[PDB]
Amino acid sequence: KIYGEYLMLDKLLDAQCMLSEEDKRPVHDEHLFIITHQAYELWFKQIIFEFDSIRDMLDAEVIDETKTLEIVKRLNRVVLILKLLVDQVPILETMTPLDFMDFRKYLAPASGFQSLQFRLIENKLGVLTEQREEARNSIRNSEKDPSLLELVQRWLERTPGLEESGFNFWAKFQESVDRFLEAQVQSAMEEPVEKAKNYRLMDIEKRREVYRSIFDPAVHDALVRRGDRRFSHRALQGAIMITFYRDEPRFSQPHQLLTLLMDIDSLITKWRYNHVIMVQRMIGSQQLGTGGSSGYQYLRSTLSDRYKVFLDLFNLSTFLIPREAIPPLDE
Amino acid sequence: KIYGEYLMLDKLLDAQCMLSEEDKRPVHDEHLFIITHQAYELWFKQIIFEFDSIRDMLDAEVIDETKTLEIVKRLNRVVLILKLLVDQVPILETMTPLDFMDFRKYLAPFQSLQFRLIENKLGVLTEQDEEARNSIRNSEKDPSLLELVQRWLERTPGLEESGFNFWAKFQESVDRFLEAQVQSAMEEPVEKAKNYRLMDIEKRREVYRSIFDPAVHDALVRRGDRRFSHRALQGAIMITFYRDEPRFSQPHQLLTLLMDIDSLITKWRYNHVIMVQRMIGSQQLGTGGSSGYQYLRSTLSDRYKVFLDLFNLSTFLIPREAIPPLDE
Amino acid sequence: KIYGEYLMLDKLLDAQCMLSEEDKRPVHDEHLFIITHQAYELWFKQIIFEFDSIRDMLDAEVIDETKTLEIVKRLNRVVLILKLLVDQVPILETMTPLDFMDFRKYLAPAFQSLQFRLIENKLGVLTEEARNSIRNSEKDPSLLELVQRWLERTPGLEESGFNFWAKFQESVDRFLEAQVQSAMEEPVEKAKNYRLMDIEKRREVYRSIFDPAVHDALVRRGDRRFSHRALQGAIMITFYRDEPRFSQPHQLLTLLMDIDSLITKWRYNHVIMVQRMIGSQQLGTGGSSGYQYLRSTLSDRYKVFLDLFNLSTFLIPREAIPPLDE
Amino acid sequence: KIYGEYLMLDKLLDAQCMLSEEDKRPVHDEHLFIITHQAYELWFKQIIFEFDSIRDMLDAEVIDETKTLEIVKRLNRVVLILKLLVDQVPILETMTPLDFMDFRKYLAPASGFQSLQFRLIENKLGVLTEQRVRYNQKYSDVFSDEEARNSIRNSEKDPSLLELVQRWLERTPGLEESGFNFWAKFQESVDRFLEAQVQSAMEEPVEKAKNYRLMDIEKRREVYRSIFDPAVHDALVRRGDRRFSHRALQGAIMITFYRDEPRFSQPHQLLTLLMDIDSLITKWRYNHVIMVQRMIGSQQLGTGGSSGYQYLRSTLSDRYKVFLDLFNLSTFLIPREAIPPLDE
């Protein structure tokens, strides 16, 4: 009912135990170390709570405009929380390496993941397991149950406009590309400067390779096997269609949903980068007790594209054609 | 020892109880409401922990350069935490007023014990559960940062009459400077510009009278316009004059950070009152009128700023050439 | 065509003239003073360009969903620029008061900025080419006026159609009647009395919007700015913000409040910087009138969309809100 | 004297020319594109002005506490400007790719570097530039005039902040053999510390823990060999793994060891701000490449392939970080009790 009881502050504010104080050698900054991590864990619980509710709203055949608005609200809220978590790094960087060295003896390393909740966030978003008892159950369920990556793909596959009997976007798009590149060739052929004519013709050939990568499903499949793409061919067609008509009321919220998924992915990378810089400022690439630089090198490897979930969304503008060449909406 | 046990996550992650879920009318955003407030409370505990350690380092006759550097580090850390707490407001503003309305029935009407402890430990004026009562009493009786900073400022080397005797040299330089301004204003060809400069010199005379006459300073303190003792104000003025000097750079950074903290608390108060109005307007069903909203608006006044004196210091400044040069 | 020519850098990067350097007494921080102000003026030109395009899109009888989306994009863009301009204040605060004192003799007293005044007038703040710009910004419709005209044409308010306002008064009457009966059966006498006094406060709140004479009196007094019908439209939008048809109109109102709030945050940060630099008064200021004027700009008399900030005062729970028909 | 004349607004506010408006096909967002870039260029001029003044204060034999404080103020000011410049990227991301596509035809690619001032900042800090030189539709000059070529040449030949900071670090009081003689006391403390670790590891009851600690002490030995053997340090500098001279690194290490001491607190803050500047430039590069990809993907019509996007991604490597040596300093740290106590 009242503030302190409602928020269970007697339990929350009783979870801070400084081991350097227990051992009669107190390091003042150990309190900061505990609070910073606990604030991260409170916000990780919030992100998991948001992610699970979004996963449940996406696990349905019909996703209406009303539910789409609520998914956008929750994804945007996760973006704000992640921005706040990135800003928590300079607060811990205020602790000197020598002060950290005076209490790191009371800390034990991890045999698997560092944080249970951080791993649950990674798995629920769609971070690849191959591209790397209640707690074991949580990890198993996060690996077996559909991730946001998979659920977003199912939603994109059912994008209205892709059906052959209806708007038939994909065929109209290949048709428009052919006419657009034909017009570019004719315009390039009339270039008075020979150098500019040759450059434009080579550039039109680069566009042809780009369109082959999406219009030939076998080329798309090879990129998925290679790890360059993750989306199914139909999820990519839906995602491309959404970027083309983002100005249209019917596609603005679906587009904002995709934009926010990219923002979340990008903010997780920014957290990883800020964390690895803080780690290096505290203990360098290796220190006494670390057994070499394997911990630091592992953190650096998490900065690769193998860890980005919605890599496909970042490249969508490669396939764009100008407004005048885009197939006009019928309905 | 390991992560989860060291951070006591079994206790920390078991303090979130949604009352709308318990009553089987769940409001999804109630979880955000709990987590946002709990993150504030964790950082309030950190600020109190920092403030108590700074208060202890300041409760000493000698405050050396090494301890000054550590106080500056901890005050700067509090500034970073306050900036993060101001940024937590837009996250809660993401909850709609209608969603909040669906769970506010489970909430009952100081608001936060730790927030009040921060106010008292910093020096927010009282005139302007047994463990909780004890904490409030100790925060009111024990010296606040406002009082301890004043004691530190009073012992500023350079103020003593036997040594550098800054205050007397400063009154002497002001007289010399204002005399030169008068002579320059007397040679102004345009009568209107001469009269403007002469009226302006007269306003400077009143400004300096407010600090060079201790009775005028005392009256301003009684009125609530100033908080500092006359000697703490002399020390603070001296520090701003020589901030570029190595000897005064860290004492100046200490004052700057106290102002930053004061300013950030006001920014939190403003962002909180805007969020409150976005959620329930000036009054709503269950508020009993607009008294709560009006109280929050009154916390935005200068009566709630602790180091009001520090913000006005530049009013007393004279140019570099007129400042008494350091001897030693 | 190429970068430097396209951006006219030969002209842009030749507009920094340090007067302390010209007089052979250089103050290094004078360069920062010039660049900071010039960055503000570049962004003020961008905000005016955005505001003028939004004013033109709002000066139309029909404002469809497609145009509403574009207005939201530009308003959100202005919010991001204002946040950036608030962050430019600590950069200038890095200059010391003594360094500023060494070059402020080359500065003249003076509105301060033409573009800042144009932004205030184009938004709707109630305070020869430059004089013409000021006159046109005062005579031509401000965003405050154009948003009111848009709110007045909110679909749902017409008596022949959805008739929101009448259904809303009807729902309020039934809701407050139910609250009275519930309060009458409160077992604790203290809680019964508190709830009854609280319902009376709600009655006064609803009288302020359901009686047009009470609304008109609040507008004359300065407590409100909106016409009665603009306020009905704004209230309706906040009630149905979860509905796809009202989400973008609501986001438009939200962004107007954000802009208003960010201008106040800039004013507050500017007045703190001013006090850090020259206190409440200094040599050349002729007293504290300049500082007191800046402090008065922090009042609600300077907020344009004050009406939008109070809208949640009129809210009733989801179950009591008239359901959408169409 | 008055606002508009002092700031030369008649000249400043007359530099915005939308080419889509000139061609009678106006794209509203083209105005944003011009202003954003012009705000970057104004702040680049400010950073260059700050960097040149810091370079001049560092190009002296004696750098006193008063000047050290002023250098710290200007480096900190640059950090605030860089943070503001990173925040300018989301403002331009507000322009849709299709709107950008409607005016990119009026833009020409560039012969060499994109911005003269951004290159001057890189060179003045100490960035080691790669190679580039790309084929374009129509050729253009790398330098607009001999004054721009001269600026680039002077920024490459004249001492960068990287070089001047090294000279300052080389003269760190405490390194001289006749005085505090830090380096010898430090090697001596490391020898005793590692000897104590060996004896403690030898008494480990569990064999697995004993072998882990002994293998870990061997890794520490290699770490200390990389700084106590000048030939190993020299090899790392030739390889590109380090940039600092051996004596500059000794001074930087000494400063991190005694950062709590008043005499070393401002020299340490100076190093910290150099790392912050380096880190913020990388953050700008990352945010810029994400915006580029959101606008035109990895390649688009007019780009001639993905070489431009791949070049920008290559600027995110450690080869572009200037003060890489400063980021690793904590690798060499020993506990407080093992650090040689200050004498004087």
Ligand code: HEM
């Ligand atoms: C003094 C500051 C810190 C130090 C020295 C530090 C150190 C490290 C190291 C060495 C690792 C790699 C372990 C290994 O696999 O060998 C790691 C991983 C990790 N740390 Fe930190 N850390 C610090 C602060 C933080 C904070 C504030 C958080 C926030 C919750 C955090 C969360 C994590 C997580 C979640 C991982 C796993 C990363 C992944 O698997 O991709 N650390 N940390």
Ligand code: HEM
């Ligand atoms: C849904 C959002 C919120 C609403 C509606 C709200 C509402 C209110 C109201 C009405 C009061 C005044 C009570 C009275 O004296 O009559 C108040 C005070 C207060 N609230 Fe909130 N609040 C919200 C979020 C927060 C958050 C996120 C915090 C952070 C800890 C917070 C901390 C406080 C504190 C510390 C006070 C006391 C202020 C002072 O005495 O100066 N509130 N709030």
Ligand code: HEM
């Ligand atoms: C060293 C820093 C600054 C000082 C000392 C300063 C001082 C002042 C003073 C004293 C006034 C009031 C003049 C009067 O009416 O008597 C004023 C107004 C104003 N200043 Fe500043 N200022 C500073 C920086 C800035 C910056 C960075 C900007 C950005 C463009 C700015 C923009 C303005 C504007 C637009 C007004 C008019 C405010 C209004 O009418 O509401 N100032 N300033």
Ligand code: HEM
């Ligand atoms: C619509 C947004 C933008 C697009 C599409 C874009 C695109 C590009 C591309 C393709 C390159 C590489 C050129 C090549 O070497 O082949 C580049 C480089 C560069 N751009 Fe942008 N850019 C954008 C905005 C900006 C902004 C806002 C700035 C700020 C001044 C900027 C500054 C630069 C600089 C300095 C480089 C050179 C980077 C380096 O050499 O490391 N760009 N940009």
Ligand SMILES: O[C@H](C[C@H]1c2ccccc2-c2cncn21)C1CCCCC1
């Ligand atoms: O202000 C209090 C609620 C109180 C509170 C209770 C539980 C958790 C957090 C908070 C809170 C935060 N700020 C004020 N309050 C009001 C909020 C409006 C409805 C009646 C109770």
Ligand SMILES: O[C@H](C[C@H]1c2ccccc2-c2cncn21)C1CCCCC1
């Ligand atoms: O394993 C801990 C780090 C671990 C940790 C333990 C306890 C509480 C928090 C954390 C933490 C946060 N990020 C990594 N870790 C070691 C990792 C090697 C350097 C010294 C700390």
Ligand SMILES: O[C@H](C[C@H]1c2ccccc2-c2cncn21)C1CCCCC1
């Ligand atoms: O009137 C000027 C301030 C004015 C100004 C002049 C020239 C360039 C920029 C500015 C400025 C910015 N904000 C207020 N002003 C003040 C600045 C010092 C104290 C009394 C005169």
Ligand SMILES: O[C@H](C[C@H]1c2ccccc2-c2cncn21)C1CCCCC1
């Ligand atoms: O190389 C220029 C982009 C270059 C540029 C030119 C003119 C003005 C600004 C800019 C700019 C900003 N960042 C990169 N560039 C090309 C790159 C994409 C196709 C058409 C513009």
